[PDB]
Amino acid sequence: MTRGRVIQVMGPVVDVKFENGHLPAIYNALKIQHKARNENEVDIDLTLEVALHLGDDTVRTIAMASTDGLIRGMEVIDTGAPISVPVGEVTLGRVFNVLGEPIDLEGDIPADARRDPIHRPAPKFEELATEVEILETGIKVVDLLAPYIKGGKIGLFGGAGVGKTVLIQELIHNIAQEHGGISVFAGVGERTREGNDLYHEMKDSGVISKTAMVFGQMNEPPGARMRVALTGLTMAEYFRDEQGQDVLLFIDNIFRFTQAGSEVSALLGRMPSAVGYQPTLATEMGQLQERITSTAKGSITSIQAIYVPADDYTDPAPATTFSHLDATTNLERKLAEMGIYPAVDPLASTSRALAPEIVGEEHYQVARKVQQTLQRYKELQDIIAILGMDELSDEDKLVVHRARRIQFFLSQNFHVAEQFTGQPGSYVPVKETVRGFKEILEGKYDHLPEDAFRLVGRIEEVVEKAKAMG
Amino acid sequence: TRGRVIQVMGPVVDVKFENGHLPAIYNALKIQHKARNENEVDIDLTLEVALHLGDDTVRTIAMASTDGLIRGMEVIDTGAPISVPVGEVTLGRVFNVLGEPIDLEGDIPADARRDPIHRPAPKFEELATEVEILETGIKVVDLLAPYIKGGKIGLFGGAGVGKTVLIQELIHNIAQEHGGISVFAGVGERTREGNDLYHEMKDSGVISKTAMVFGQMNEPPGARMRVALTGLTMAEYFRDEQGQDVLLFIDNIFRFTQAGSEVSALLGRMPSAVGYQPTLATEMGQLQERITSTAKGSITSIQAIYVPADDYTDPAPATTFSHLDATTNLERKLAEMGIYPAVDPLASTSRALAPEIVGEEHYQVARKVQQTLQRYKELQDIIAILGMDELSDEDKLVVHRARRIQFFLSQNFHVAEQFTGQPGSYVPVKETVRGFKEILEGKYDHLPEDAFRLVGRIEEVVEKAKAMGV
Amino acid sequence: SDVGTVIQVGDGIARAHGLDNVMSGELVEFANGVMGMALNLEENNVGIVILGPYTGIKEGDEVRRTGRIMEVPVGEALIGRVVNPLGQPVDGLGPVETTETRPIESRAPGVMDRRSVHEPLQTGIKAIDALVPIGRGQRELIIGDRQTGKTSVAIDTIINQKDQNMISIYVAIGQKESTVRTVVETLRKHGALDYTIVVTASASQPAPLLFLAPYAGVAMGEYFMYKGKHVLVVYDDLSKQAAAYRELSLLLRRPPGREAYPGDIFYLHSRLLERAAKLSDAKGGGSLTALPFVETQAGDISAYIPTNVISITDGQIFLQSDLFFSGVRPAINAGLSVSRVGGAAQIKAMKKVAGTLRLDLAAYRELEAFAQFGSDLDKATQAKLARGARTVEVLKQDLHQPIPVEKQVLIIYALTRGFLDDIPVEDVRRFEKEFYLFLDQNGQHLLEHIRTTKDLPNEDDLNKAIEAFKKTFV
Ligand SMILES: Nc1ncnc2c1ncn2[C@@H]1O[C@H](COP(=O)(O)OP(=O)(O)OP(=O)(O)O)[C@@H](O)[C@H]1O
Ligand SMILES: Nc1ncnc2c1ncn2[C@@H]1O[C@H](COP(=O)(O)OP(=O)(O)OP(=O)(O)O)[C@@H](O)[C@H]1O
Ligand SMILES: Nc1ncnc2c1ncn2[C@@H]1O[C@H](COP(=O)(O)OP(=O)(O)O)[C@@H](O)[C@H]1O
């Protein structure tokens, strides 16, 4: 639209001076594309996001790509609008960077695609809906003791190396296998290794066309790692505003979204607060998570993983998100290093839709008996360690005898773990889950060896494995 | 060539050289003024350049108090750094930071050789290393963390822990044995201890083998900065040009860095860490690298380090910890307990605790001692909660022998005759190992624990137990 | 134009007039001949950091720009040498004579260029090989306090690569030079010097040099990877690199951050650590695996830099001084150390035995915490304690005595199946060494079966061979 010269470069931060006085708005997009005139110059193409107005026709911009080789006096052009990711049917089976440019070598998107600005005012109470709909995943622990909800936000909490990304991937796979719905996956500051693994797993599963992917890698400047989640959300918008269906949006690690925001604030000279966090923390978190709502048309249900640093949940980044969550799942390393997979703590995981009238009273009663037995077992293990299983009385003995089997049967083999153990994997219907747990609690299978329950799906698979072992 | 003073803020001054010539960094400038009237004060001052400012201006750290300075005073440029008198003349004498002598015994003529204090460190090819033990006669160091000849030795502690007692004991024994040139530089010490040490040396006659540079608490920060470098400069000549083995003693090195931090804010440096200057590690490594043993000569350097709040994790002690080869850390709890010196058995280390250096039996004895002490260290927390009657036989024996051991680590000292009125002792390494082997095997369980307190050799333990009447 | 005067000089930083066509990161040289990087471009001045001895520079000096980025000379002739961050020898022995040069600022291997990590990297440390396995391409972090056996693990790793075909690099940042010499002599005495390169950036060196040292190491690692050879890289301390970067940034007046660290810490360490990779069969299958080190105060794992580096890496090896002085060396906390490539970077018999070993250790880790205090216990409670004690004894090994994998898997097979029940705990340590000797002399066929097959030998042969040794042992 209009052009101005660079005046200052201080790493990611760049400053431009629009001499004539026509200034870009905040959150606008600026383009630098240069060709070397002398043998000492370099060729660079750069995207800059405006952040401030500084007076006397100067603006302060955060760069979305590495700023090396910038020269004062080189021309910047104004696009006239925010960073606009192309959206539509053209983005299925394709992988993009933050700027909405295809990472894949399968091709380049043409000018035909409709382009949606990443930064848009959040939906009003124009049509937001209060209705509650349960989403089935096929995982016994998750469906039984912490049901997820359409349009709701679900949180996965744990340390490093506990099982979050495997759970996210098998959620994607099972949703495509049974529900058949679209999904969108965005990685905030993702590792190249795990992103490559995810692409290869989706290609093997035949899912890549169902889902879409936006990648933001750690070696990129902080601003891109910040904005990648918003461009992924803008991709997810189209499939429920225009195509009007039940969408999912996955986010790799919001922790990095907060960290990148803090780092950008530091680069901009904003005064720190709390534990080094930026001044505008919750205004960013809320502006992210308040566009993820189910109107009458579509859900944009979200499942998210967030990293807790040191087994402490009081850090500002986990604390702010904890005020947005409809269901929360806590993953424990002690489970992860046991034979019980997936590592999901029954007692620490809760959902606001576990109400008896939402899930049905049979579901509620079965879940409540499950949790009661697990709590009694946790209490009794202290006595068992010192005095043994034989010291306690018959009621406690039967309680622990059922509790161990419940602990094992919560585990099940899944289709993404084929790499790790060479076993196929299973899906369990929700009514089958509740019926099996009801039969276990009622004790129809007291005679079976406890090993049969270790990693199978339906209870008849326990019967088959018991037949196999002998 | 002359420059005019234009600013003065405590330690720092701002000369302006408008003649068309400017001094380099680290140079020395002179002020000599005659009072024109009864109001003016006659002043004799020298200033070292520390930073170049913009318009014919430099920032200069004053070497002495700045009272009486008038804006518009005239400053002479010497054209070279601070010069120190180098040679055999330094032996016996005591000097200040600028190179003049402090004792009234005489003066040093113009013909003496003088060297600048600032120069680059030795290169990688020049260094050499060895493993030879340097016996101290101190049971703790000899048995748990042996010092090594030619290796850097560090004493870490806060105020009032036993640092200078150890410095004096080591200097007494080593100067009794070694035929080495010695240089003693006191940085930020008590000016009373300098006189006391001078008189003790005159009693010992070692003063002819020693050269001393003194700058203490009552001095402006610049002298506190440069004093250790002056002492090192003398040790440099003795190590290299004479090719004679030298010892360098510095007590409470820290004040070198502290003086730099104090004037750092006056020099326009943004704060860092806990108030420290940004350039901490550069300067500390710059000092420490010049103190090395080459093939031309060897320096055995024994250093004491002070912690501002007794927090070992403080930046300054943390940076220094990487430059040492043997460290004894003294902390207040042992001083409170009455066991002396206050060296921590489980946090003091040396590069010499290896069977290829000290032998198999010595290494096994030391490691077994440390294991017993760690077992008691956890057992204190266990016993506090449960009591002392719930432990088993072996757990009780651990406490018994740990109590017997940490007392025997206490020794009757020579220089502690004033403080406690006892003769003192020198314990050979073989006797320490024999006694500790007797202790660990339970050969002296019957003796009461008081018999083991503040004695040299296990025979004195038996004598004290005989005195107790057992 | 290109000519301009210097208006300020101090602490290894300068500012200059002119230079209106300079570029960010461009190398700049003074009349003194020392070189420096232009890092800040302002409306009428340039901020320059000096890569050398700066005391000679004065106000009014004219300054010039080279026109290039910093290039590290790269060749096969560097192996065995000791070098600076710059391409200049400091070991004597004359010029290294490299082939050519590479810019150090480069983009990393991207997505779809990488295969899954499947081939092991062998350290010879029983605990790490069994319970925290590593593969070529993995970015495993080793983190701990002072004096808890950190660099002994890197030296053990580099020494063991003699049997394999690895290329290794050791980068020392901000360390004392005599420590570099001691490590070089330790390596040379064990013969490892010919397949290694040592890069030295001591603390005395000007701060910008320590800023460039890790990238200096990766530049050579990348050349060797793209040729197609496997590479192992060790950074001895990223903490000192962070300190040097903070000092350089503060002198430049860039706005501070959490612990006064600048806002570019994560950007810099990620730019550094994303170059490690495992390349595809199309590229050539080369691999640049990295083992960065981080040390931080008093076991507080929760600081800024430790958490950044923990968030960037694929695993952590946690070293505790508490465990060191308890008689368990090298002191590794198996519980707190995370392995994300556990079963994929192991040989088949290692997977098979090590899964059960980790099950035993995890079972023991909780019961031991409190059951010992109650002297009276049920019969079966104490058995697991005994098993865990024998496990922790079996995982201990002397300094600089690395082990081939097959003897590890043999002794761990002996452990897991309960063959060590008769042996009192003290005899267990000697049992391992005498068992190794007996298998070397008598049961060589098992070693041959594992060496050829890469799989566990027939159970009957293993049982007979292990049982035969127990008869001699007393
Ligand atoms: N071996 C010992 N036996 C008895 N008392 C001792 C012994 N060592 C030290 N002390 C006592 O502890 C005091 C410690 O004083 P010292 O000069 O050693 O302190 P420091 O550790 O150097 O501290 P500072 O840094 O404050 O100068 C001595 O004055 C003396 O009273
Ligand atoms: N298997 C082992 N058995 C006994 N001692 C060991 C073993 N492995 C390492 N050590 C000891 O542990 C120490 C490790 O020294 P090293 O300098 O490598 O450690 P570091 O943690 O990197 O040190 P620093 O914090 O001082 O830099 C040495 O004293 C060495 O003797
Ligand atoms: N069902 C499972 N069975 C065995 N291992 C698993 C399973 N799910 C995840 N893992 C382990 O998790 C690791 C993968 O990392 P992951 O836990 O998904 O990342 P995150 O650090 O986000 O939790 C692998 O080492 C794998 O062994």
Ligand SMILES: [Mg+2]
């Ligand atoms: Mg993950």
Ligand SMILES: [Mg+2]
């Ligand atoms: Mg003192």
Ligand SMILES: [Mg+2]
């Ligand atoms: Mg080191």
